Amino acid sequence: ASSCAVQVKLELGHRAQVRKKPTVEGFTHDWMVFVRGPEHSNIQHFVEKVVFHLHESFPRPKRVCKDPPYKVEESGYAGFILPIEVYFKNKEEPRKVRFDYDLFLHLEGHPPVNHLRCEKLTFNNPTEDFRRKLLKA
């Protein structure tokens, strides 16, 4: 007869800059995409791994990060939808959360992309293990 509601704050984001010189393959942008916690918080306490599903046109498109930083750097020629799966150190439903991230690129002659997307997860009545893992962040 008592309730719990844990709330964690995640930050998804990405930067994208037009290359001074495009690569031999025609890639014209350097971009990086990241998942992190605010103000250098340590989300590893409850995040097992983070999976970046790149477009099929990329070699080894399913990138995995088991340790911080949860980022992917790459060079490319067009934007796309990047599914990001965040897996928690949870043994109960739900193990991970999915985010469809709009990784867009701006044209040359425009200021580079520095995009931020704040997300906020609320877990209700979790297990005590997951609870203390979540609350150590």
């Binding site: 942008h29 020629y77 067009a78 934007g79 796309f80 044209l107």
Partner: peptide, 4 residues
């Protein structure tokens, strides 16, 4: 840029 263009969407892929």
């Amino acid at each position: 840029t263009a969407x892929x």
